[PDB]
């Protein structure tokens with residue numbers, strides 16, 4: 001069978017936490033007052049929820065209300081428990097309340113509000129310095145949640161809220177996040193297609209926090225190279241082919257051979273043979289102001305097939321790419 005794997009950091013965090021910390025199925029929700037919140041406008045809809053701007057009438061402050069569609073109560077408790085565990089951490093969205101919506105007959109999560117700019121327009125305006133600054137702020141959030149025993153599993157631009165006026169960043173949408181337990185096998189149907197790590201694309205279930213670092217590398221590559229998304233697959237099979245055309249097929253085979261994994265035979269006629277490319281080939285006159293040797297080295301150390309070889313969040317924060325970022 002497949003070779004097992006463990007996280008190289010924060011491996012035992014949940015082992016030595018009290019069971020109440022990670023045993024989300026036993027969590028007892030503390031419900032707030034549903035009439036404290038007045039919905040103002042709908043902001044979005046997903047497969048699992050709708051999100052609204054709202055006003056908390058007990059303080060006349062804007063909040064954001066996520067009304068869940070019906071889903072396994074286990075998954076609802078998981079997201080609530082994770083949000084409560086991480087509340088107050090650096091750049092983690094703050095869950096302010098949980099209420100029962102009388103119309104949907106489901107829980108409604110109430111969050112702090114972020115006056116954000118959509119990434120489609122924000123990414124066209126960010127400077128080299130802005131990108132380093134906000135990448136550092138995302139790493140603070142990821143090192144925190146990893147240090148707290150949690151993997152996010154849906155890192156992508158749409159889940160990073162940025163109020164550019166106040167240089168404020170929040171990592172949102174913890175609905176796919178999970179507790180890391182050594183040796184646990186996880187669902188590989190997580191993350192958005194363009195941000196799925198090779199471990200998900202080869203169906204390796206014993207993955208860990210390092211999945212988030214692949215997704216972050218995909219974000220970085222799209223920003224410094226001005227190509228969004230960077231790995232633009234048309235389905236989950238073509239997604240791995242897009243990656244292999246950059247990282248090469250020999251190291252893909254080294255990866256699956258190390259964990260004694262077999263590729264889906266449907267790759268026999270689509271994968272081809274590809275050399276590993278140098279990142280300089282993606283540099284051109286319209287993105288070179290966002291590229292430096294430090295940026296390419298940092299990106300190279302995030303985008304590794306082997307989840308065990310990627311920078312950890314803490315290691316990433318030590319990288320020379322962040323030397324120019326003003327520290328507080």
Ligand SMILES: COc1ccc(/C=C2\S/C(=N\c3cccc(F)c3)NC2=O)cc1O
Nearest residue numbers: 044045046049050051064112113114172173
């Ligand atoms: C503008 O300010 C904020 C915006 C969002 C959030 C928190 C969210 S949105 C979410 N899921 C979605 C995403 C898209 C569509 C959908 F129907 C649900 N999960 C969270 O935690 C907090 C804010 O302050």
